[PDB]
Amino acid sequence: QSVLTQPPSVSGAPGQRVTISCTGSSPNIGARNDVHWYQQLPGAAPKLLIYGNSNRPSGVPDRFSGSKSGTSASLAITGLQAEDEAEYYCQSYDSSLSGWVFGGGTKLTVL
Amino acid sequence: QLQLQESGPGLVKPSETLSLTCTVSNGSISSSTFYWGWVRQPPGRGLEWIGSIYYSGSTYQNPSLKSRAIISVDTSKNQLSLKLTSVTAADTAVYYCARHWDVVVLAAARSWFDTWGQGTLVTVSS
Amino acid sequence: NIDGYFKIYSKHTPIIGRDFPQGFSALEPLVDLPIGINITRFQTLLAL
Amino acid sequence: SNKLDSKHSGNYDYWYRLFRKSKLKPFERDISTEIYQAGNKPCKGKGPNCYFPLQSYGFRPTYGVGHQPYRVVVLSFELLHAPATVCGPKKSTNLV
């Protein structure tokens, strides 16, 4: 039921740029649907970072920047720190299932 | 600030009903503006949306688990109730009560989950 | 002495030295250091 | 640092000055043993009206929080228009 495709894992040096991507099928999630991004520390509740593909809530650092084009969506991280390692999730709305869906979850590792 | 407290039996024998309930503090479940929902995440897998429910009784619900999941809401005791039947070994997961899907202005495609519970690790064993 | 940053290029050709050679010899850089001061005069030292 | 500047029977190795003819300009060292003048006497010694410029920082392992031998290292940078000489440890990644 993973209509959104995510990279199983990714890694990078601290203070560097990493990009996390999320895309879905064509007859499923379309151009109008927007993609939100969730962070999950181990053993904790998922935390929101970016919604609306370009907006962040209060308290979310400006370092996390995302964008959505067509169907594919992606994040950009600047100034990677040891606190950024977590379980990241992409999620959006599937018009064919009439219900929300979640990405497979990507592993961000600090090197 | 809005807090969620959900509880339930963390161990359930195979093949009968499983039941949890979330509590809302510093707020009201009667709040018409937002929806309320349940999200489960099996260990070593991704998040999965099991259904969302409005205060009146209208229910969002994933077709894949149509025949097993029943969700009920009450506004008097501010309790969000979730039931799951015919639980098998594939249903081992940690369940979360979530608040999302604003009704007044956002549409059903731009809805994002906003408030998350602490989670309850629930397993089925013989 | 462009923008500080003293640069020294050198190559020691082996051509005898009986006269000024006409052959082509390039110059490989040796050091490039941020001296940061202006230079206009230039002398040379001797030995003993 | 209570493990290097403190010991049994005390330690009065450190000194500090509380009496000066004026204030100290920033980034200035004022190493001198001149008896501070009181009144108008040109006296040069110890006792009444004649105070030594510097006193001690007698440190012991048993004091209060505010009397502990704090180790202070301050770093001053020159962030002006000049060729760079000292810079941070720029990070590195793998090749791939």
Ligand SMILES: *[C@@H]1O[C@H](CO)[C@@H](O)[C@H](O)[C@H]1NC(C)=O
């Ligand atoms: C209706 O939607 C528009 C755009 O989605 C928004 O600007 C406006 O505030 C909404 N009005 C109400 C009453 O929800």
